[PDB]
From a paper:
All of these relatively small but significant differences in the binding mode between (S)- and (R)-thalidomide molecules suggest that the (S)-thalidomide bound state of the thalidomide-CRBN complex is more stable than the (R)-thalidomide bound state. As with the previous structures, our structure of thalidomide-bound CRBN TBD prepared with racemic thalidomide revealed that the bound thalidomide molecules are all (S)-enantiomers. This is also consistent with the notion that CRBN preferentially binds the (S)-enantiomer. We found that the binding affinity of CRBN to the (S)-enantiomer was ~10-fold stronger than that to the (R)-enantiomer.
Numbering used by the authors: 321 to 349, 360 to 427
């Protein structure tokens, strides 16, 4: 009901609408849903900064633990002074609803 599940298998809650936050800037200074917390995702490989959509963070591929759908990435901060130190960037179209 606040629940966002893997679209492919519909078994797993991946996150909730409660966890949604926005790193995008609201002044003169979408497709990716960023959430503080998520569940039921397996991380693949190791963090990389190449082409990172969120400068300062590295990414690790995250897939649904049940059906292996590529749902998004775990983003991890490269510096200790950043907040959050970690979040999830989730492909909206890989989630239901
Ligand atoms: O922060 C991110 C997550 C990974 C994402 N990524 C991809 O989605 C992709 C597809 C094919 C070749 C290379 C990449 C790449 O780095 C990307 O470009 N930046
Ligand atoms: Zn799944």
């Amino acid at each position: 009901p606040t629940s966002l599940c893997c679209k492919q298998c519909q078994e797993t809650e991946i996150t909730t609408k409660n966890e949604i936050f926005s790193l995008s800037l609201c002044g003169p200074m979408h497709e990716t849903l960023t959430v503080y917390k998520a569940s039921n995702l397996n991380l693949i490989g190791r963090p990389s900064t190449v082409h990172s959509w969120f400068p300062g963070y590295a990414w690790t591929i995250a897939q649904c633990k049940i059906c292996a759908s590529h749902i998004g990435w775990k983003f991890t901060a490269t510096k200790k002074d950043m907040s959050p130190q970690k979040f999830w960037g989730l492909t909206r179209s890989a989630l239901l609803p």
